[PDB]
Amino acid sequence: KLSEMVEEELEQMIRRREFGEGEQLPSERELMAFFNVGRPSVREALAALKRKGLVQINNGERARVSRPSADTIIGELSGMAKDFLSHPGGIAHFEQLRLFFESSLVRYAAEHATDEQIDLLAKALEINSQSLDNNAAFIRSDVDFHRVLAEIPGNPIFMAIHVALLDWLIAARPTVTDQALHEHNNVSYQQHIAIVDAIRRHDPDEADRALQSH
């Protein structure tokens, strides 16, 4: 069990950046005095770290830390984020994460959007008088509103982030029906109108409140 404990502490020390990305790990003898454990426990812990891919060890050299890659960190977070959606409280936690992003977007637009950008937002809400399918018009207005909103700050990754957050939720649910989208879109349209009204008034507090009115 001692070997598991030095393994866990060494893994945490690696994540805490107490060791860089070099051969930085101490020798076996130092690890023994550091933890007050025997050479077998130290040897076993190092072997487990190597099998996990956390260190490189050659020919009785000193271990070299190899931090988890971007893909493994991302893989862990994404599996966590995906699993939570199967629980009702996971859906609530993920909606709040999305809300944090959308709050900052609507507050930023209210304080920084030019008149040209505000007109772009309002145009996204413009429903044609001759529109034959009002439900389709609301779906179109919904997509177009969020694209303009997410692009206002000029950051080229924001739009992909916003779309990924909605896609993430949709992917865990069975396909949305046309009928349920209709009442959701009607609700969304009202909330978008109030947000744009607040952005026109350059009022971030009002914009945030229209977003959160639930």
CB of 133 to ligand SLB, least distance (A): 13
CB atoms within 10 A of CB 142: 19
Residue 177 carries which DSSP code? P
Task: Pick from 24, 56, 104, 117 the residue near a second copy by CB under 8 A.
Answer: 104
Binding segment toward ligand SLB, per CB under 6 A, in 14-22, 49-57, 78-86, 134-142 = 134-142
Residues 38 and 13: their CA atoms lie apart, in Å, by 19
Q: Is 142 in the site for ligand SLB (CB under 6 A)?
A: yes
Q: Which stretch binds ligand SLB (CB under 6 A): 58-66, 118-126, 136-144, 197-205?
A: 136-144
* Contacted by 1, from ligand SLB, Zn ion, a second copy, none: CB < 5 to 8 Å by type: none
Determine contact, residues 11/54, Cβ cutoff 8 Å: yes
Identify the residue among 142, 185, 199, 207 touching Zn ion (CB under 5 A): 142
Instruction: Tell me: does residue 51 bind ligand SLB (CB under 6 A).
Output: no
Beta-bridge mates of residue 65: 55
Name the residue nearer to ligand SLB (CB basis): 62 or 192. 192
Work out whether the CA dihedral 63, 65, 66, 72 comes out positive or negative. positive
Nearest to 93 by CA among 160, 168, 189, 157: 168
When asked if residue 97 is in the footprint of ligand SLB (CB under 6 A), the reply is: no
Q: Which two tokens stand for residue 91?
A: 């859906």
Residue 187, interface with ligand SLB (CB under 6 A)? yes
Query: In the set 60, 100, 128, 129, which binds a second copy (CB under 8 A)?
Result: 100
Does 213 bind a second copy (CB under 8 A)? Our answer is no
Structure tokens at 11: 């893994």
Segment 28-31 long-range contacts (CB within 8 Å, at least 24 positions apart): 31/6
